[PDB]
Symmetry: D2
């Protein structure tokens, strides 16, 4: 089968031919119908040799949608042909966090060597993929697979981050979204669907600001040195109830601390090496909590799928072939994918 793999430290992903896999006991083989590119793939491929821990080669792609092709021995709950999305942050399934479907916060996964598809286990950017267990599949019914693939991360991660502090986001609240890319442009729509928050979007690029308005942002602000003041002008000196930073650079985190309200929240979702919020007296308002959330929970993925089926999400995508896999990643690096890049095998 055809797949797109990271094969050498510091090199670009390449199209390879590798054996179509066979599902073992408990496992499920999907024919992949759509595979999303995530900016985290770029972070991974940029890691120095001394830090990269996912193994080589690695079939990329941790946003996966497909149809069930073959059932491993003993698998129940799905039949051949079923359209499903892959729950990515695999956990042990048995610890206290896993018991609540919070497998993203599994306390055993690291020790047991359990890794996500595309991030340690073979990913979805191939004609076929293996899923470890039936509980990491979620039915999507007749959802267009291309729009559905981003739901597994671009949808799921912001959904989780927002969900952590949803009770803060009542009428009169303001939510700031920094970074209107794959995650950001979906995060705006989630905010509008599950809360009455006023949504202020922030990006370096005017066209991304335009995208922000297209998907529902009430306001759009240019990132950089003037952004904090501009956000405050919109909120009055009260500041923003919550800031969801899908960039996570030191500059954006700094902006977030300068606009967040007393008893508010900063979610640092974007990943930038060494960048960090500075949480201490006189450096952040009283009671404004900060967190680096990770991916999302099982029930949350189901909720994201429900938003999509209700027509509440307009996922902006561009489609590529598998052969275009490497070219798509160059486009992602350069910031020319207006939304989510999705490979259709």
């Amino acid at each position: 089968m055809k797949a797109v793999q990271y094969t050498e430290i510091g090199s670009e992903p390449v199209v390879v031919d590798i054996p179509t896999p066979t599902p073992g006991p408990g496992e499920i083989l999907l024919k992949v119908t759509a595979a999303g590119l995530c900016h985290s793939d770029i972070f991974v491929m940029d890691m120095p040799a001394a830090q990269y821990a996912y193994g080589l080669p690695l079939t990329l792609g941790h946003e996966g949608v497909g149809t069930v092709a073959e059932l491993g021995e003993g698998v129940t709950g799905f039949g051949v042909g079923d359209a499903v999305a892959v729950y990515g942050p695999w956990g042990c399934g048995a610890c206290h966090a896993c018991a609540r479907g919070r497998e993203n916060y599994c306390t055993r996964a690291a020790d047991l060597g359990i890794t996500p598809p595309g991030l340690g286990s073979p990913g979805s950017m191939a004609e076929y993929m293996i899923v470890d267990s039936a509980r990491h599949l979620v039915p999507i019914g007749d959802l267009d697979p291309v729009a559905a693939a981003p739901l597994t991360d671009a949808g799921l991660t912001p959904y989780h981050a927002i969900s952590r502090v949803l009770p803060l986001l009542g009428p009169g609240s303001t939510a700031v979204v920094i970074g209107v890319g794959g995650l950001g442009h979906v995060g705006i729509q989630i905010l509008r669907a599950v809360s009455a928050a006023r949504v202020i979007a922030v990006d370096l690029d005017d066209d991304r600001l335009a995208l922000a308005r297209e998907v529902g942002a009430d306001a759009a602000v240019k990132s950089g040195a003037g952004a904090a003041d501009a956000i405050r002008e919109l909120t009055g000196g009260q500041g923003a109830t919550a800031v969801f930073d899908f960039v996570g650079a030191q500059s954006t985190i700094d902006t977030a601390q300068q606009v967040v309200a007393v008893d508010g929240h900063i979610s640092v979702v974007g990943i930038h090496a060494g960048a960090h919020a500075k949480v201490g007296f006189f450096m952040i308002p009283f009671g404004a909590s900060v967190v680096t959330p990770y991916w999302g929970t099982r029930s949350e993925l189901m909720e994201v799928v429900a938003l999509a089926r209700a027509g509440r999400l307009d996922i902006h995508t561009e489609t590529f072939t598998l052969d275009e896999g490497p070219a798509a990643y160059r486009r992602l690096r350069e910031g020319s994918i207006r939304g989510r890049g999705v490979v259709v095998p």
Copy 2:
């Protein structure tokens, strides 16, 4: 009347003789029965002239209990003789936060120049004090005033910090308490009363470790370079569900980040200028939130008083006269008060 005041930037507090205040409309005059010393007083008195903002002179004492002595015009809801504790973090009373009793997170107080007694307004460390409004008094009934004064902050503050994440502290959880002083020793007892968390205490002083055990900590380990390893030995690789740092030095925050669990919590309660948690990827576990909480809410103060009335709080105190005020603050600076220092005018 006799009072203890901060009078000169960089000097020691001095016992003075100022006029006895008279309650204006809405105000209540208390005969002060007990005034707690707080380590925050030391921070305030150590601020450079360029940073000190509370005005000179200042009557110290933001932990106050007393008996209703005189009602200002219009005041209803209390009678002369009523024993009361004073709610410290005064708010505008009208904003969204205040409307929920969360006056500590009032978004108007700073602009309106509303300040706490002993931290901008005349404090409790005098024979008498003024309270601005009935809603800032809470009934204590027949509670011993000496052990009651500390409830207003030594109790309230850790109680609020713990309350922010109470749902995390189920059976099986671990709470670490760094700093077993005024706040810490009460924080331990709160944890034991409102949760099933296992409580691990940390301090530099072995006698304070003993105190931690006396008030019900399950374990108590020396602070410093070996603390994180010792803590982890006790919890196993899982780490602590929540860390309540009542020291807030960089070293103690660092320890906090080194032991906190995935999806856990760090509460930086102690105040050390420039000290801050570093919240970013690869520097703290996924999902581990961090906050600097501030004082507490009105209903929380009521709840702390209810804990004390139910005999759940063994508050350790040393009693001083007003004249001993300055000396008591020296005792606190050097760390020789086993618990809370309390002045009885």
Copy 3:
């Protein structure tokens, strides 16, 4: 001044001339700009002499908006001319419930004879009204008073009822609204604004079904014997996550129990003498909780006003003069006010 009063048991309200009131200490005098009619007014007037406890005469009107006309001694926080809404369920202001702004659940108000305007205290259906304390006024800025008056109950009450179980109403959830009248037509709109719930409206009146669709209901079905089956056809055998019954007749409550989901919720909001949910095994699904909520909290009222200011609420009203007061109550009785009747003095 002119006012509409209930003056004798079993009779209709009448237009009377009574003295314009003078604000005492702490009180505020409003020039009333809008007074809403509530169906609870009909319940009150329909009570037998032996049950009616609100005293006679009684100036009706517990939905009130006005401008501050006169300040009582020592009142602060408002100036003459300020546009305000009246928070109705007055509480003691000092109990644990009140300290959280939940004055609707005040545990002292009964004992202290603290009653709401229009429901024991003189109401808003008059040229002027007295408000007991500044904490019972909420600023409405430039909101049109006619549309604003219903926010104080028709908005507040459903808002509170929904807010009790907001975390249940995630994507994929369903909320049934029974009764598309004053409260119901606003409750529909609150659901769409603060949740991703699908909204199914239920009413006896075909024109009210149309109103439900006009204000955002995803579906509307005829009430009565066939309604449960029809609701279930819409939701599949899962049933409705939550049912908000703004009628509260035995028949509508029976419908609610027949459609509510496992671990769902029934909020019996509407008031019908003797009607009640029957909560017992085999009579209702496991975990489906039931409550009769009352009015709403202070912070909730602020949140309702914020919804209105953000253009999230389209309140359907019909305007009457004071002289038309009694005629308007007759219209309310016959069910010919499409939304909320509002008197403009």
Copy 4:
């Protein structure tokens, strides 16, 4: 193997000899070390033929602990020898409720015919039992099996009921526990461990009131006509924040409604044919929610075990042989087991 089975409508259970089961794919065979008797078993056996739905014969016992004796094909996560407690309310594992581990509220189980061991599937009152899947096993380590068995229901069910409203039970709150039997005597101890509530116990029998005090009730009161007054005598006319009714007869539910506080909670846990709370205006206080909860969640069972391991639970048991099975049910019917009856095969 020997087992205790319900074999004939209206008859007592009998000791039988039936084949030892063999684990199918995914299933686990346990050697049973302890099997708890529950009063629900009596309710089941008292069901008329027309209502009884669990099939005959039925091996009784929905409280089970044992050691892993054999793994079915492809089972992972447990080894032969492992000591485990059985999670009883089996769900589909894949719906939105199950994804959160709330299998007790699975919306698919009825339609799929998924039934609990002892309540439709073969129970634990036998030398060996089958568990359908690994996710329904929780490790107990070296916990004594006799005292562990009750954790799976007598512990889990009260734990879940209390957990639904735990935020209500702060310092100053009162929890009433009606019925100090298998569940009740554990419920009292859970309240003391996970909250600061004052616990008032109610029972018909003085010796059960003695039991209540032995396990930490703050007060004990005779059930019946005088109970409501006696509870209010203890709580002051304020009422009880929460009432956990482990009897659930019309009379005890009536008592609960007569004592519950405004904005409080009644949990109808006990099962008595036809009895129900009557939730309507003037029949119950404002905001006081009522629910019939069912069993408990996966993470809750883990928490219960964690309480036991930390020594927070003193489970009163009497031990029986399998041969004494029927005799023990006679003892339970007459109310002469002082706590929980446990069969040790």
